[PDB]
Paper text:
The nerve haemoglobin (Hb) from the nemertean worm Cerebratulus lacteus (CerHb) is one of the smallest naturally occurring known globins, being composed of 109 amino acids instead of the ~140–160 residues typical of most globins. Its structure shows a markedly edited globin fold with deletion of the N-terminal A helix, extension of the GH hinge region, and a shortened C-terminal H helix. The affinity of CerHb for O2 is very close to that of mammalian myoglobins (Mbs), and its function has held to be the storage of O2 for release around axons and brain tissue during periods of burrowing under anoxic conditions. A second distinct structural feature of CerHb is the presence of a long apolar tunnel that traverses the interior of the globin matrix from the heme pocket to the solvent, between the C-terminal ends of the E and H helices.
Restrained refinement of the carbomonoxy-form of CerHb (CerHb-CO) converged to a final R-factor value of 14.6% (R-free 17.9%) for data in the 24.7–1.5 Å resolution range, with ideal stereochemical parameters (r.m.s. deviation from ideal values for bond length 0.010 Å and for bond angles 1.3°). The electron density clearly shows a diatomic ligand coordinated to the sixth coordination site of the heme Fe-atom in CerHb-CO. On the basis of the shape of the electron density, and in view of the way crystals were prepared (see below), we identified and refined it as the exogenous CO molecule. The final refined model indicates an Fe–CO distance of 2.09 Å and an Fe–C–O angle of 172° for CerHb-CO, comparable to that reported for Mb-CO. Two main hydrogen bonds stabilize the heme Fe2+-bound carbon monoxide molecule. On the one hand, the carbon monoxide O atom is linked to the Tyr(11)B10 OH group (2.64 Å), on the other, it is hydrogen bonded to the Gln(44)E7 NE2 atom (3.10 Å). Specifically, the Tyr(11)B10 OH group is connected to the Thr(48)E11 OG1 atom by a strong hydrogen bond (2.60 Å), while weaker interactions connect the Tyr(11)B10 OH group to the Gln(44)E7 NE2 atom (3.06 Å), and the Gln(44)E7 NE2 atom to the Thr(48)E11 OG1 atom (3.56 Å). Moreover, the close contact (3.43 Å) occurring between the heme Fe-bound CO molecule (through its O atom) and the rim of Phe(25)CD1 should be noted, indicative of an aromatic-electrostatic contact, which further contributes to stabilization of the ligand. As a result of the interlacing of side chains and hydrogen bonds, the heme Fe-bound carbon monoxide molecule is fully buried in the distal site, being totally inaccessible to solvent. In particular, the CerHb-CO backbone is nearly identical to those of other ligated CerHb structures, such as oxygenated CerHb (CerHb-O2), and aquo-met CerHb (CerHb-H2O), with r.m.s deviation values over 109 Cα atom pairs of only 0.10 Å and 0.16 Å, respectively.
Author numbering: 0 to 109
Write the structure that this text describes.
Amino acid sequence: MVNWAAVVDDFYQELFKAHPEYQNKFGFKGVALGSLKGNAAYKTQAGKTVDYINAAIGGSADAAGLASRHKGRNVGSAEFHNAKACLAKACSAHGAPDLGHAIDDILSHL
Ligand code: HEM
């Protein structure tokens, strides 16, 4: 099976390296990037992200619900376009299928 946990770890590395201020919205605010794997708040967030990816692939993802929750954190379309680029880089680095179509589903509600 595709190692989505490894893809997601690479995704967060890319995302927070390009946009370090995004990290301030999370329970692992301030934690060095090379330390995220040892952080409990990060472990939970990464696990939910992997779960979302598996739900999107499996056909049960609630993209409108995820979009609404991100609006609830003042996260919008621009941030998601940035995330889409970071996730594409992560997928490619692992020889994983691109998830652009899934992210476009969320973007359609942003
Ligand atoms: C590839 C695009 C993204 C995916 C798949 C994704 C996925 C998720 C998931 C699955 C959750 C948990 C939702 C829940 O518990 O109901 C979440 C929460 C969150 N996301 Fe994202 N996200 C994306 C992009 C972003 C971006 C660009 C930001 C910018 C800061 C962001 C900020 C947040 C925040 C602040 C939370 C709440 C974390 C908490 O409860 O402490 N997300 N995201």
